[PDB]
Design a protein around this ligand. Structure first.
Ligand code: MG
Ligand code: MG
Ligand code: MG
Ligand code: MG
Ligand code: MG
Ligand code: MG
Lengths: 5, 236, 236, 5
C-alpha cells in the first residue's frame, strides 16, 4: 500500500 | 454524549494519556467529547483528533482487507462453499468502519469546518474530510460509490486551492494533503498519471523552498517529501 | 447473549476469522458465545478461547502499567499537581480489565471447569483460572488482595497436582502451567526462591523426557522450556 | 517482564 499521513 | 459531564481540559488531558497507553478508541472518544464542547480546536488539539481517528480506522481498514481477501478467495472456481459467515463478518467490520467515518465527517460538518477561517485549520479539516470519504470509497460498491468518490475529490480540491494560495510549498499540512490526494488519484479515482504528476510537482516545489527553512522546519518538510518520493518509486 | 442467535459452528468460524484479522475483542466475544452454547470445548476451541482473552487482557495490562507509572510519577515529591484525571483514567482502564477477568472466570465457573474431566481440559481451565486471578492480583490493592492471591494459588496448585499425576513432564500444558505458576510466585506471591526452584525442576524433568518424543512434540516442548530458561536467566 | 503463556 502507498504512504498517506 | 457520554463525555458531556467532563471538562474540556480534562478530555484533552485524557486524550494524551490514552495516546501514551496506545488506547486509540478511548483517545478518539475523548477528542469527540472535546470537539462537542463547541469551541474551535488549537493546532495541537486538531492533531490529537486526527491521530486518534487515524489509528482507529487504520486498524479497521487493515482488518477489512484481511477479510475481503478471504472472502474473494472463497469465491474462486474450486473453493469449497463455506456459507455466509465470511461475508457476514466482513460486513460487520465494514459497517463499524463506515460508522467511524460517518462520526468523523459528522464532527467536521457540525461544526469544525464552518468555523475554521485560518488556512492551517481550514486545510487540515478539508484534508480530513477528503481522507474519511476516501476510506468510505475503499469499501463502497453501490449506487453511491461515485458520489462518495466525488465527495472525497471535492474536499481535497478545495483544500488544495486554499493551500496553494495561503501556505508555502513546504508547509507539512500542504505536503501531507498533496501526498493523500495523490494516493486518492492512484488508488480510488483510477488516475495513476494525475497521482504521479501531483506527487512529482509537489516534491519539486517543496525542494526549491527548503532553503527558507530553519533546521527543525526542514526536518518536518523533508520527512513528508520522502513519503512522496517513496510513492513515486512504488509507482514508476 | 448478543451471540445467542448465532450457530455454535458459525461462532467458531468467525472466531478464527477475527484471529486472522487481529480483531481479538471480536474473537473473544465470539468464543464467549460459543462457550455459552453449553457444550464442552475441543482442544482447538479451548485454545481459541485462551488466545482471544489473552490478547484482550494483554493489551489492557500494558495500558494499565503505562497509566500506573504516570500516576506514580505525579505522586513524587516536586511533581506538579495535575488533578484527578490520571487516577480517573487509570481506574477506567483498571475497571475494564477486571471486567474482562470477571467474564473469563465466570465462564470457567459456569460451567467449563465442572464439566472438564480429562486431564488436558481440566488442567487447561484451572491454569486459566489461576492466570485470570493473577491478572486481578496485579491491580489489587484492597481488603481483597490476599484472597485474590490465594484464589490464584489455589487454582494453580490443583492444576499442578493433576498435571503431575496425569501428564508426562514434557506436556506443553503442564510446562506452560509451571511457567505461569513460577511467575506467580516471583511477581505476585513475593517468593522468588519458589519461582526459581519450580522453573529449574520443571526444566530438568522435561529435559530427561524429550527422548520419548517425535520431532514435532519435541519442538512444542523445547519452545516452552526455552521460556523457563529465559526466566531463570532473568532471575539469577 | 518475565515470560508467561
Ligand atoms: Mg467547562
Ligand atoms: Mg456493506
Ligand atoms: Mg493541478
Ligand atoms: Mg445449533
Ligand atoms: Mg480500582
Ligand atoms: Mg512443590
Amino acid at each position: 500500500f502507498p504512504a498517506t499521513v | 454524549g457520554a463525555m458531556g459531564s467532563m471538562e474540556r481540559a480534562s478530555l484533552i488531558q485524557k486524550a494524551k494519556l490514552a495516546e501514551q497507553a496506545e488506547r486509540y478508541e478511548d483517545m478518539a472518544a475523548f477528542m469527540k467529547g472535546a470537539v462537542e464542547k463547541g469551541e474551535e480546536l488549537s493546532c495541537e488539539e486538531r492533531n490529537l483528533l486526527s491521530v486518534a481517528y487515524k489509528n482507529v480506522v487504520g486498524g479497521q481498514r487493515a482488518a477489512w482487507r484481511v477479510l475481503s481477501s478471504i472472502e474473494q478467495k472463497s469465491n474462486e472456481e474450486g473453493s469449497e462453499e463455506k456459507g455466509p459467515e465470511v461475508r457476514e463478518y466482513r460486513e460487520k467490520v465494514e459497517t463499524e468502519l463506515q460508522g467511524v467515518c460517518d462520526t468523523v465527517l459528522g464532527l467536521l460538518d457540525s461544526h469544525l469546518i464552518k468555523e475554521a477561517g485560518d488556512a492551517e485549520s481550514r486545510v487540515f479539516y478539508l484534508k480530513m474530510k477528503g481522507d474519511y470519504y476516501r476510506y468510505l470509497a475503499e469499501v463502497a460498491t453501490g449506487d453511491d460509490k461515485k458520489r462518495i468518490i466525488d465527495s472525497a475529490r471535492s474536499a481535497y480540491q478545495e483544500a488544495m486551492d486554499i493551500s496553494k494560495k495561503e501556505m508555502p510549498p513546504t508547509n507539512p499540512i500542504r505536503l501531507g494533503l498533496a501526498l493523500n490526494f495523490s494516493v486518492f488519484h492512484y488508488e480510488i479515482a483510477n488516475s495513476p498519471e494525475e497521482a504521479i504528476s501531483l506527487a512529482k510537482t509537489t516534491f519539486d516545489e517543496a525542494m526549491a523552498d527548503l532553503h527558507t527553512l530553519s533546521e527543525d522546519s526542514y526536518k518536518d518538510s523533508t520527512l513528508i517529501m520522502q513519503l512522496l518520493r517513496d510513492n513515486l518509486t512504488l509507482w514508476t
